[PDB]
Amino acid sequence: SGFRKMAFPSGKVEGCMVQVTCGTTTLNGLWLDDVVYCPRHVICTSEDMLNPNYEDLLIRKSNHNFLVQAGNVQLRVIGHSMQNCVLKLKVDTANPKTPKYKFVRIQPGQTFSVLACYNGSPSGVYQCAMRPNFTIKGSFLNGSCGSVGFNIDYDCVSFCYMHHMELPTGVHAGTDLEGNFYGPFVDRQTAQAAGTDTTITVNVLAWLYAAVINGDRWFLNRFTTTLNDFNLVAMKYNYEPLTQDHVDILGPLSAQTGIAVLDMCASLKELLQNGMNGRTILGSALLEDEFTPFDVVRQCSGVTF
Amino acid sequence: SGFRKMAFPSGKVEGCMVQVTCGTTTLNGLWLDDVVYCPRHVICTSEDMLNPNYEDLLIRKSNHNFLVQAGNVQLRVIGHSMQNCVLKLKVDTANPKTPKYKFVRIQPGQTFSVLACYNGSPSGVYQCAMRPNFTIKGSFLNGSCGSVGFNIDYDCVSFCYMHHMELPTGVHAGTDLEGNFYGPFVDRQTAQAAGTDTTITVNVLAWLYAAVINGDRWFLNRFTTTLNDFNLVAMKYNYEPLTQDHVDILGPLSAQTGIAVLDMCASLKELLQNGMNGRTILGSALLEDEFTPFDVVRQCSGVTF
Ligand SMILES: C=CCn1c(-c2cccc(Cl)c2)c(-n2nnc3ccccc32)c(=O)n(-c2cncc3ccccc23)c1=O
Ligand SMILES: C=CCn1c(-c2cccc(Cl)c2)c(-n2nnc3ccccc32)c(=O)n(-c2cncc3ccccc23)c1=O
């Protein structure tokens, strides 16, 4: 039945996006209840971004200096405060489109959908993973700051990411909705390096399981292995160490396919040592690591919202 | 700045999805104004699907045999008619969430977003192309019939696809919103073959342009070529013949990058003849053909809706 990088339906998040302007800097905000959340660097000019003192810069800013626009409607700002690297603008109107929602700080390797926005308007939606070095490989242009990443369970939106910046390498960094960056990055235009980008081994395994479910079976080999033997191979190829929590989380996929997790590890090992020989798996010519075990099950079982 | 398979924001389509039941068969419908559209095979049992006489089967069906459910609300069916392979159920209530919309029949090689639905509820969204053999490579499970593909321009939804079936090969077939299948397929459970799946050459070129825009430049070679010389190579590799309309449509990407279209063709030629040598382009280890020139420009310029 096929296998795609599938994002969550984005309508619940679309109705929360607004445009936030301060002076001559415009970006996106997220309007939930009577609070608008946005990157605190909305208060900065280009000259500020080289070395900003946010507390000093914010002192110069009153409620009426923040223009918040929801579609055509202008919201009245009655309060502002900085929480870590986000600003929270209190407005006089609760968003009537507020979904049920939560703020969550995800773990590296987990995935989420991004609704890329410009000027408070949605442009498109795609699925992403938090990399082990805490960057994301997104698609973001100037003006995209404030766009949000989320997951949806039934009717509840779990916001996990707010986009802040592009690194000089072209990968992306940002915060949770409490304003704490993922990773060591800071909201300053200085060179910052990400660290080694390793591969999310438990996600690769899940996708191999997905491939078996879908009939792509050529890579299944005759071998098995051990957790320590496999991790010797993982380390050599900059794969994340596989732990017993990871084996456990793969239990349902192992059960569905009748392939023991350590057998699948030995197939992955042989793929790492021998490459793919010009073949493909689920239409990809490399090992994909942006599907979690839950994504695989969710997609292969038709979970809805 | 990165490059992703990006779908359109799906909220406008979410509020049109409903569940349609007839006897013991349930699938999705699309509720626009006071009409619900769905695959006519909603009227079939398993035994029917082997060789259905739809006109005969429909005679047995009255307005009250179609149960249409919108969220929890039950819609009152006051009219039904078959148009090619879709049913149109007239209901007594206009959808209040009806967006501006159009029905369009797309050309092979064009792309669109799919909102995969089960029981009238959205599950996820992803981008797709109509393949040259008129199949799509989707992600669809039992119950997904009736899910729709669309494009969005500003505020207008252009519906282009309604999912009907999976072929024995695991690829997907369906109709436009007038009920006419893409391709030679019929809504019967008989073996049907798709034809040779060729590669959408103008889309590969666009994505190569995208790669240059994003800094991935290693594949640019010293050669140029001619349209006839290139097409000799395209035919050998099951690539669609490139025409002068295609060259024309690539004009803005050529202008942005300063790379003449025929020069990019010679780089593609060398990639087809030499492979990729274990390298990657925009994070892919094969040549991607599911981005149109408009998708590339749209993504690389931040068009919103
Ligand atoms: C609406 C957002 C504009 N904004 C800004 C920016 C924000 C406030 C004031 C100014 Cl003066 C600039 C970016 N900056 N600049 N230094 C930065 C240091 C720390 C954090 C962000 C930084 C920034 O990186 N981005 C981009 C994010 N993602 C992808 C991009 C692709 C191309 C260009 C910019 C991108 C912004 O969009
Ligand atoms: C809600 C849809 C159920 N429906 C049906 C179906 C529809 C009406 C009556 C019955 Cl009795 C079956 C499928 N059928 N069956 N013969 C078919 C011949 C022509 C057209 C469709 C056909 C069908 O292919 N699909 C699948 C579509 N896409 C992916 C699938 C993956 C797994 C299983 C089914 C899938 C349906 O979901």
Side-chain angles (χ1 to χ4, degrees), chain A residues 1-46 48-71 74-153 155-234 236-293 295-305, chain B residues 1-46 48-71 74-153 155-234 236-293 295-305:
Chain A
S1 291
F3 201 76
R4 285 278 188 177
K5 210 153 253 180
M6 187 174 297
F8 291 99
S10 61
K12 278 157 190 264
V13 179
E14 296 167 46
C16 302
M17 299 313 294
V18 297
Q19 175 194 262
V20 180
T21 303
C22 187
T24 68
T25 304
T26 287
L27 43 65
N28 308 279
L30 182 74
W31 180 19
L32 305 165
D33 302 326
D34 65 348
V35 179
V36 173
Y37 304 78
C38 69
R40 65 173 174 176
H41 68 225
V42 72
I43 69 186
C44 290
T45 66
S46 270
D48 297 318
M49 285 310 312
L50 302 176
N51 179 41
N53 189 307
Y54 284 94
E55 302 76 5
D56 280 356
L57 288 169
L58 195 55
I59 278 161
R60 236 57 63 167
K61 291 312 181 170
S62 294
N63 290 334
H64 66 271
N65 289 131
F66 293 97
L67 283 66
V68 180
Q69 195 171 328
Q74 206 67 43
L75 309 182
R76 191 180 292 285
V77 173
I78 62 174
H80 67 278
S81 62
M82 183 166 71
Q83 174 173 21
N84 300 318
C85 300
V86 296
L87 292 187
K88 301 186 287 199
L89 310 175
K90 190 184 181 56
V91 295
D92 65 353
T93 298
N95 185 350
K97 287 164 155 172
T98 304
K100 296 179 205 201
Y101 75 90
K102 312 205 304 208
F103 289 171
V104 309
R105 186 181 177 84
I106 64 169
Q107 298 292 307
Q110 289 188 281
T111 53
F112 58 87
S113 299
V114 175
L115 182 60
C117 293
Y118 295 89
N119 293 304
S121 296
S123 177
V125 60
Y126 53 90
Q127 187 77 355
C128 271
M130 182 50 64
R131 304 307 300 166
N133 65 4
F134 288 107
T135 66
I136 67 167
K137 305 182 156 262
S139 189
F140 287 117
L141 306 162
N142 181 53
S144 53
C145 321
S147 297
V148 297
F150 56 101
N151 283 277
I152 299 179
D153 174 2
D155 61 346
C156 178
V157 178
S158 286
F159 296 105
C160 52
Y161 175 77
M162 174 170 270
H163 184 52
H164 289 235
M165 55 192 302
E166 196 168 269
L167 300 185
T169 60
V171 299
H172 296 119
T175 68
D176 61 30
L177 272 293
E178 298 188 321
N180 294 303
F181 264 90
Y182 291 97
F185 312 108
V186 297
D187 43 358
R188 177 179 168 194
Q189 174 196 32
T190 174
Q192 335 190 19
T196 304
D197 197 4
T198 53
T199 305
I200 308 152
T201 310
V202 58
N203 290 7
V204 176
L205 290 161
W207 166 83
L208 286 187
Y209 276 111
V212 175
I213 291 170
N214 280 267
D216 228 340
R217 294 173 11 257
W218 66 263
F219 55 85
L220 298 181
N221 73 0
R222 334 179 195 108
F223 304 74
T224 192
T225 192
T226 69
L227 212 45
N228 278 351
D229 177 64
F230 177 77
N231 280 337
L232 278 198
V233 171
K236 187 153 103 187
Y237 283 91
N238 289 336
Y239 267 61
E240 235 70 37
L242 194 76
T243 75
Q244 184 61 50
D245 285 352
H246 295 150
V247 174
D248 285 348
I249 272 172
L250 287 165
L253 288 169
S254 180
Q256 174 132 72
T257 65
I259 298 153
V261 177
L262 288 173
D263 294 3
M264 193 71 78
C265 291
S267 296
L268 173 54
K269 167 169 168 202
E270 293 300 307
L271 284 166
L272 289 179
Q273 283 170 0
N274 296 132
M276 290 193 28
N277 267 110
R279 284 180 82 87
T280 65
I281 299 184
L282 286 177
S284 183
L286 38 69
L287 300 181
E288 168 83 56
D289 77 345
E290 294 218 351
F291 292 97
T292 69
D295 299 338
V296 178
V297 167
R298 160 159 68 83
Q299 190 168 161
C300 291
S301 89
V303 163
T304 65
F305 310 97
Chain B
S1 291
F3 201 76
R4 285 278 188 177
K5 210 153 253 180
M6 187 174 297
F8 291 99
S10 61
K12 278 157 190 264
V13 179
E14 296 167 46
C16 302
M17 299 313 294
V18 297
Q19 175 194 262
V20 180
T21 303
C22 187
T24 68
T25 304
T26 287
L27 43 65
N28 308 279
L30 182 74
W31 180 19
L32 305 165
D33 302 326
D34 65 348
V35 179
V36 173
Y37 304 78
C38 69
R40 65 173 174 176
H41 68 225
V42 72
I43 69 186
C44 290
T45 66
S46 270
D48 297 318
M49 285 310 312
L50 302 176
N51 179 41
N53 189 307
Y54 284 94
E55 302 76 5
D56 280 356
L57 288 169
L58 195 55
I59 278 161
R60 236 57 63 167
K61 291 312 181 170
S62 294
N63 290 334
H64 66 271
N65 289 131
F66 293 97
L67 283 66
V68 180
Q69 195 171 328
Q74 206 67 43
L75 309 182
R76 191 180 292 285
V77 173
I78 62 174
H80 67 278
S81 62
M82 183 166 71
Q83 174 173 21
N84 300 318
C85 300
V86 296
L87 292 187
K88 301 186 287 199
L89 310 175
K90 190 184 181 56
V91 295
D92 65 353
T93 298
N95 185 350
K97 287 164 155 172
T98 304
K100 296 179 205 201
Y101 75 90
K102 312 205 304 208
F103 289 171
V104 309
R105 186 181 177 84
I106 64 169
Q107 298 292 307
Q110 289 188 281
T111 53
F112 58 87
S113 299
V114 175
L115 182 60
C117 293
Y118 295 89
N119 293 304
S121 296
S123 177
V125 60
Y126 53 90
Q127 187 77 355
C128 271
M130 182 50 64
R131 304 307 300 166
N133 65 4
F134 288 107
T135 66
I136 67 167
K137 305 182 156 262
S139 189
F140 287 117
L141 306 162
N142 181 53
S144 53
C145 321
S147 297
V148 297
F150 56 101
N151 283 277
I152 299 179
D153 174 2
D155 61 346
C156 178
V157 178
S158 286
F159 296 105
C160 52
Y161 175 77
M162 174 170 270
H163 184 52
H164 289 235
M165 55 192 302
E166 196 168 269
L167 300 185
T169 60
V171 299
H172 296 119
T175 68
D176 61 30
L177 272 293
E178 298 188 321
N180 294 303
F181 264 90
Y182 291 97
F185 312 108
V186 297
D187 43 358
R188 177 179 168 194
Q189 174 196 32
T190 174
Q192 335 190 19
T196 304
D197 197 4
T198 53
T199 305
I200 308 152
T201 310
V202 58
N203 290 7
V204 176
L205 290 161
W207 166 83
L208 286 187
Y209 276 111
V212 175
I213 291 170
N214 280 267
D216 228 340
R217 294 173 11 257
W218 66 263
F219 55 85
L220 298 181
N221 73 0
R222 334 179 195 108
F223 304 74
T224 192
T225 192
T226 69
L227 212 45
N228 278 351
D229 177 64
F230 177 77
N231 280 337
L232 278 198
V233 171
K236 187 153 103 187
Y237 283 91
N238 289 336
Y239 267 61
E240 235 70 37
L242 194 76
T243 75
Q244 184 61 50
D245 285 352
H246 295 150
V247 174
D248 285 348
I249 272 172
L250 287 165
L253 288 169
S254 180
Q256 174 132 72
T257 65
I259 298 153
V261 177
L262 288 173
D263 294 3
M264 193 71 78
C265 291
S267 296
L268 173 54
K269 167 169 168 202
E270 293 300 307
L271 284 166
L272 289 179
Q273 283 170 0
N274 296 132
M276 290 193 28
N277 267 110
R279 284 180 82 87
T280 65
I281 299 184
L282 286 177
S284 183
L286 38 69
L287 300 181
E288 168 83 56
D289 77 345
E290 294 218 351
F291 292 97
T292 69
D295 299 338
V296 178
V297 167
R298 160 159 68 83
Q299 190 168 161
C300 291
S301 89
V303 163
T304 65
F305 310 97

